[PDB]
């Protein structure tokens, strides 16, 4: 009986228990006609965007049209915005601006401030190691996952994200998409209501920070 591996086994079991604890209807003809008109409007808008042809933005997936065209679906695939209330950081280039303009009816995006970036990474920060969601509870995870790029701490990660450094792609890919909460869930008469209502298209600029503060 080696006490070192006994204590190591006890610790491994305790942290395992800790992470386990921490972890057809009828369709209306009006619905059919509305869905066709939505798809024809989306097709016209996408055709117009395709015919027409570095900052930091925060993008939150919101509820929009139920049927999504394949090109916005693929852009949501690469932007990791499948579920509602998922948030990501995006470096603003020409290609990313075109993607954001394409998926505008399903997103709410803007310019996050330093407080929003810091609070998002500190309070809801998860990294993707081995394809798994690991909370950022120490600087060691960042050191062994992004230490080849000179990023050895959470503050280095925040610096890369906020200043949009050379390794912004690596930092944002390491960061898991943020799962933001619904403030309407705390009140029973508005329990089913979505927090962000669609319709306010375009850049919200610095007003995305109100949404981030409310939902983070």
Q: Pick out the residues of the known binding site for Mg(2+).
A: 189
Query: E strands, the chain, where?
Result: 56-61, 86-91, 107-110, 126-129, 132-135, 178-179
Quick one: 40 or 138, whose CB is closer to another protein? Answer: 138
Quick one: 70 or 189, whose CB is closer to another protein? Answer: 189
In whole angstroms, the minimum distance from the beta carbon of 141 to another protein comes to: 10
DSSP 113: -
To the nearest 5 percent, what fractions of the chain are helix, strand and coil? 55, 10, 30
**Residues near another protein (CB under 8 A):** 1, 3-4, 6-8, 10-11, 14, 18, 21-22, 113-116, 118, 122-126, 135-140, 143, 152-156, 158-159, 162-163, 181, 183, 185-190, 209, 213-216
CB 127 within 8 A of CB 145: yes
Would strands 86-91 and 178-179 be described as parallel, antiparallel, or unpaired?
antiparallel
DSSP 176: P
| Nearest-angstrom CA–CA distance, 185 and 211 | 15
In whole angstroms, the minimum distance from the beta carbon of 106 to another protein comes to: 23
In whole angstroms, the minimum distance from the beta carbon of 9 to another protein comes to: 9
In whole angstroms, the minimum distance from the beta carbon of 144 to another protein comes to: 11
DSSP 188: G
């Amino acid at each position: 009986l080696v006490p070192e591996t006994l204590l190591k086994k006890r610790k491994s079991q305790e942290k395992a228990r800790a992470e386990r604890a921490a972890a057809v209807i009828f369709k209306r003809a009006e619905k059919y006609v509305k869905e066709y008109r939505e798809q024809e409007r989306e097709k016209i808008r996408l055709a117009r965007i395709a015919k027409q042809q570095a900052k930091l933005v925060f993008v939150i997936r919101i509820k929009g049209i139920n049927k999504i065209p394949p090109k916005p679906r693929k852009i949501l695939q690469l932007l990791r915005l499948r579920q509602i209330n998922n948030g990501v950081f995006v470096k603003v280039t020409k290609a990313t601006a075109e993607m954001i303009k394409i998926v505008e009816p399903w997103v709410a995006y803007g310019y996050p401030n330093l407080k929003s970036v810091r609070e998002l990474i500190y309070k809801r920060g998860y990294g993707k190691v081995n394809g798994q969601r690991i909370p950022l509870t120490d600087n060691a995870i960042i050191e062994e996952n992004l230490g080849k790029y000179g990023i050895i701490c959470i503050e280095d990660l925040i610096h890369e994200i906020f200043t949009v450094g050379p390794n912004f792609k690596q930092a944002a890919n390491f960061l898991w998409p943020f799962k933001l909460s619904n403030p309407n869930g705390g009140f029973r008469p508005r329990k089913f209501k979505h927090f962000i209502e669609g319709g306010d298209l375009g850049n919200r600029e610095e007003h995305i920070n109100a949404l981030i503060r409310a939902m983070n």
